[PDB]
């Protein structure tokens, strides 16, 4: 049986990690601010791939410690960790054989960060989940989003429209066949048992492309629960937006629910964003979600040195002290 | 006097700064107070006529002495120290000798010290009183007029704007007519006073310090007097931030450090620099480990409220403390 | 006023009311981003919320100094809340004693003092009025709209007045809304601009009656597009929607004063947004939320003056 | 020496703090620096082997000496003072005598002092140098080991963790082998130096202070020396905030925009444009130069808010001076 179903129902609390090249710019570019989402900075300022990709040469997070990050999650009662394997910028945070645009090949750090977090989660008894941008890829000429630019974004366009301005010649199929599916096979084959699969903004993928991803994860990771944002109705648990939380909606036939939130207002690390939700806010939101059978996936944006920001760490630990006190009395 | 043994093990107190300064909330005519919003009258040399008119707007509809004492109690605080009269010279109790007080001069028309005394008595918390015995900006002969060679959290130590003739200022007149009469009032009314919180005497003679000590002793035999009354007239030493382990003799081994949660004692809109729960708990643990009481200040807002972030950080520091003490 | 509005470029908006005294906080808990919605957010009974009037004594309120700040910043008009959703009038209303003149120790007509200050300085004067929502009125609007979330709880007062089936907005419209609109349009001289808000309950006919009333009493008053379908002179554009046009914004994230909101837009942000709007022929109406003492917050004033210094420097070079 | 007349009327300078400390950005293993993020090595007693490894991660891809000098110039600043070597003992120039420097030890592999010297020359700005002549946490005989009866923005004045034997310490060795050789390097290799910024001498003998003074005089005849080289060896007095003899009537007050000299992610306490302009006007009215510090971030950038507040202070100043 898949007892990840029963496990997910009672899991209550997860850590999400956003970490990438965007973390080095830290919500700032040439004296101007990112939107609230610092991880969208490449689109926000239309930073050419040649320049943005050169951030890889400065990626050397000397204080990255997968063990200490997992130990914080565990101390907070988090039962799983979801990490960005590849965000919208298309930079892989694992050793990708199909694309050299990755943290292993292109940075002096020269380490597989997904691998180190997979190993740390295994040793601590935490379940391990993977975030992958299956639609948007700003590094790929045929990256998705080029049909969706009638709606505003946390950057400029959904796609890379500056390096790749000819929208009528764009064919996502090529990106899907050559990068998206090959990379999904890599992350689902090389990093042990994957509990959760976190797909984002499905704007371009056909039904068939969503189905192919679903079928691939099922084959490689039989017990992996797929998030409702894969597109076109292919999933195991529903990712609820802030507006969808109890006081259209997606059916959840397994009754599995998760809301992702961040501690400040950005997913990626941002120097200027000190708007940290208080311990009381974190604990009360958690209790509310859990009471309605919804998992709280709570995001950390690691800094350029690979660190949990001091205030993210203090607020997580203080929320846990409030929770433990509330559960004793 | 088993207030001695009680004080030794008390570990944690609430301080309250509340006055007319609370209404300006760290801002005057588009400009900022210093870090100390309660010093705003001196900072901008606000004439007594104008500053005193703040009394007409003092109507804190949400002031609840019971809820304030319940917060202190939930946090493991064993006593409460409150400003009866700060440097501005505005009494926060019904003073018979001076009509410049919260009872006579405000539409609130209530004795706030009396309500806190009653609330502390019913909840079993010890009750302490802060009184500015030297500085009084409302009094023509208020102290500080000899000390203006050293900078302040305002301009001058004294009211030098309403009362500019520093030669033939005579503190004795303020001491005899306001300071000692008012100290007798707070120490006679309001029941048993556990702690007496005087401010660093800049103008007081030895004899004037002695007279205050002797008065508190007579009226409140078991009241512990803070070391800032004047040289050698005290029961416990008030240690400043700079005086804390990693100095005034304390023959009873009694020590207390006062601190605030943000950087101001009085309420300040613009000061959101709230010490984190971890900072509050760790500083408390450090002080207590050295046998020092942590007196932790709240600056009540214009409606008589504990600021939301002061209350959240106090309760979170308590949750961290309880968790640390179980494991 | 048509030609004048086209070239006006910059206005000051004022949110000021009983909500300003709670300042984004109630019994240890935060308002939403909108501190002026606090009564709905915590369902504060009218008896308690109304008692805030007894504590409304803003000793530092100075309409002359507020207009002088707007003028120094190159603002050519001022729009002020005469009555927000809570239903508390900030002028001497003859039809309702729930107003700043009758119910507060301040005992002054704040709209009157701003009207006089604007006239003497040569600034145009505009009026905000909540024609639909009124939390003080048993038949206040919004009781049909609670399928969509708000910056409080419900659109209406559903706590003092929980019987939604017995509610008839017509009664509120006839007895308070239209009488009060006649008062503000009759008693405070020439009104340049009329700022109505979310029409959720108003019939077409009720919107028409308001339009016709403002037209009669204030022939030259330009009406904002949020009165109701097709009854207006200029379009109020939201941030997402960016020949008369105006966009309203605030300096922090709240319209009413909120002491916990220190998220002040920088001078550079204020100037650049203004330049962008003006380049598209859109007026920037920029909101101040006055504090409990009637003051422009220190940081609102510093950022307004610094934005003006950046603007003047950019326009010289 | 018409640097004297020039300094009298200069009114406004940019200071730069930039080093390995900038990478930690006021945070170490989940704890905060003091208000001074540049003191982080002493604050947490970070061993030299670990702290020095920050050099391997120093790759500021957005460092642009021309854009930094252009900002200073737009703000009416007439000079730039930069940290050549702070207390940690890491040189921000290509030092021949010590390989513990930004050129030899970092992948950036560039002389940052040289690029700022060249940028200042081309823009017509005067160029000044900060050097920690007493404290050196990288040197076994670094100063401060006599001064630990007074508290610091870290722990000890000296490196007392890598070098705990205080009785075997002899500053003379550090002075002879690193301090004076390095002062000769910065005063020889980067063209005309207008200003020399030494820090309060705690360990230096009178003779060692004299030798520094005499060396700067020989190599840079027109260089004005700050009063924090020992008793009576200076050309202008560095006034503290609380102090607001000078036989040339030359005065300068240094301040920072937030509360830290080095970059600190957690310190968003930026003085407002109005505060910067009013403090400047006050200092200038008393004949005091305002030296205003920027702490560059790990990518070599002026923090967004430091740049916005500098430009807005200038707009307020220009407006005030027209009306
Ligand atoms: C968790 C969030 O999902 C969104 O759709 C993304 O666009 C954001 O970057 C973020 O990762
Ligand atoms: C507790 C504090 O003691 C200081 O010395 C006073 O000057 C402050 O205003 C405050 O009362
Ligand atoms: C200007 C804004 O318009 C909205 O409709 C209101 O609900 C807000 O409180 C504010 O007054
Ligand atoms: C300019 C400042 O004053 C001194 O030099 C140092 O102690 C500080 O870190 C900083 O360099």
Residue numbers in the entry:
A (entry chain A): 1 to 247, 264 to 345
B (entry chain E): 2 to 247, 265 to 345
C (entry chain G): 4 to 245, 271 to 345
D (entry chain C): 2 to 245, 267 to 345
Text taken from the publication that reported this structure:
This enzyme is particularly relevant because α(1-6) linkages form the basis of human core fucosylation, which significantly impacts the function of glycoproteins such as antibodies. AlfC is a single-domain enzyme that adopts a (β/α)8 fold typical of GH29 enzymes, with an active site at the center of the barrel. Our results suggest that AlfC employs a conserved hydrolytic mechanism with a specific subsite that accommodates GlcNAc in α(1,6)-linkages, while AlfC tranfucosidase mutants work by shifting equilibrium between open and closed conformations of an active-site loop.
In contrast, N243A showed very high activity (~90% yield with respect to the acceptor GlcNAc), equal to or exceeding the yield of E274A. We solved the X-ray crystal structures of both of these enzymes. They exhibited no major conformational changes compared to AlfCWT, with CαRMSD < 0.25 Å for each of the enzymes. AlfCN243A was nearly identical to wild-type, including at the site of mutation. This is not surprising, as N243 does not form contacts with any other residues in the AlfC crystal structures. The differences in dynamics for AlfCN243A were more subtle, with this enzyme displaying increases in deuteration in some regions, and decreases in others, both less pronounced than in AlfCE274A. However, like in AlfCE274A, the region containing D242 showed increases in deuteration, suggesting that this enzyme might also sample more open conformations. There was also a large (103-fold) decrease in turnover for N243A, implicating a role for this residue in catalysis. Furthermore, in our studies of AlfCN243A presented here, we showed that the fucose that gets added can be hydrolyzed by AlfCWT following treatment with EndoS2.
